[PDB]
Design a protein around this ligand. Structure first.
Ligand SMILES: Cc1cc(C#N)cnc1C(=O)Nc1ccc(F)c([C@]2(C)CO[C@@](C)(C(F)(F)F)C(N)=N2)c1
Length: 379
């Protein structure tokens, strides 16, 4: 039941949200990163300094070796692994066990993070971006094929500042959101690709050709921390935010997201930072809705006992060369419905949405645009 699935996520700020899963027979329990930006189920399967535990295939009598290898290099990190299948379950998810592909990670470089408390990644996106190729069926596909679970899941990611989170598989849980749920089309089933049609910073339109917002794609990715923007859009956003907060002086490389800024506890000047509104393509022609992002989201609190006399933050907006990424800081405070069955993504204000006495995160619509341009970058 959905009530059983509530609060089945944990996380440390800036380290990722993970769910408990089991693999093998008898079941071996692991914490697994929930990642809508990739499509492999990959788990550490050998000793590593940053792993508290790992998948031991020899102890599973249901493991099947596919006798095939896979190498997955990422921007900074990388891992090598062997492909196989085994029985998989989510103890606080749907009441089922399925057989699924598993990439058993035997070597890795800068992939596992010290202190993250997760031991693998659950890629929830589509087969088209699975490694080594689209023939390796992703977990969620296996789940839907082998069970009667509806082809839909939802994420409620909660920041540390507001009430962790929930992954609900198979349906929508209404106690997890207030107001209307607004849907934007999934443009293409590989990443969860969507279309941004307009960007405002404190109510001021950036006035760019809307294709620029979706160079070279725009995705929803729980496995990315920041809001990531194409160079042109990033520059316009930083300029606008800088202008609004000009009464205060920021450390040199703060806008590069390298450097912390701190204020005396409780004194963070939230009101001098603008809200960001992202207008997403609606289900009806030239209609859209907007999600509004507060500084409480895009100024990310960095938890470190050593700096804990103050409140310190990193700038959680960064420049991208591979398109817009609406990462965790964006998803936080919203209930996000990945409605694969109807090829759409829903947004609503979640129970743990961010706000202060003056402003609040919001999902609002419909808005109508006169211009009939297709905002997609690639047909
Ligand atoms: C610190 C952290 C904080 C939060 C928050 N809040 C969420 N996730 C992490 C994290 O560790 N993520 C992570 C680690 C290793 C990886 F190999 C990947 C991959 C498979 C590849 O990289 C991307 C980003 C993509 F493909 F887009 F490039 C992706 N989505 N998944 C992700």
């Amino acid at each position: 039941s959905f009530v059983e699935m509530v609060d089945n996520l944990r996380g440390k700020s800036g380290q990722g949200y993970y769910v408990e899963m089991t693999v093998g027979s008898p079941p071996q329990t692991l914490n697994i990163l929930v990642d809508t930006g990739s499509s492999n189920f990959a788990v550490g399967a050998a000793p590593h300094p940053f792993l508290h535990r790992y998948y031991q295939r020899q102890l599973s009598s249901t493991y099947r070796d596919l006798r095939k290898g896979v190498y997955v290099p990422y921007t900074q990190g990388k891992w090598e692994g062997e492909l196989g299948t085994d029985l998989v379950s989510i103890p606080h998810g749907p009441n089922v066990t399925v057989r699924a592909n598993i990439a058993a990670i035997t070597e890795s470089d800068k992939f596992f993070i010290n202190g993250s408390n997760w031991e693998g990644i659950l890629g929830l996106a589509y087969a088209e971006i699975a490694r080594p190729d689209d023939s390796l069926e992703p977990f969620f596909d296996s789940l839907v094929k082998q069970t009667h679970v509806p082809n839909l899941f939802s994420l409620q990611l909660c920041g540390a500042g507001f009430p962790g989170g929930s992954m609900i598989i198979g349906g929508i849980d209404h106690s997890l959101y207030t107001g209307s749920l607004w849907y934007t089309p999934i443009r293409r089933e590989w990443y969860y690709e969507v279309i941004i049609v307009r960007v405002e910073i404190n109510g001021q339109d950036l006035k760019m050709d809307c294709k620029e917002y979706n160079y070279d794609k725009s995705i929803v990715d729980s496995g990315t921390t920041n809001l990531r923007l194409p160079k042109k859009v990033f520059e316009a956003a930083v300029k606008s935010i800088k202008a609004a907060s000009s009464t205060e002086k920021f450390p040199d490389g703060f806008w590069l997201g390298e450097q912390l800024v701190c204020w005396q506890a409780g004194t963070t000047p939230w009101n001098i930072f603008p809200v960001i509104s992202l207008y997403l393509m609606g289900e009806v022609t030239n209609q859209s809705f907007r999600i509004t992002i507060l500084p409480q989201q895009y100024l990310r609190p960095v938890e470190d006992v050593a700096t804990s006399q103050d409140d310190c933050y990193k700038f959680a907006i960064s420049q991208s060369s591979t398109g817009t990424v609406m990462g965790a800081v964006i998803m936080e405070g919203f209930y996000v419905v990945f409605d694969r069955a109807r090829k759409r993504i829903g947004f609503a204000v979640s129970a743990c949405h961010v706000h202060d006495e003056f402003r609040t995160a919001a999902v609002e619509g419909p808005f109508v645009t006169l211009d009939m341009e297709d905002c997609g970058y690639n047909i």
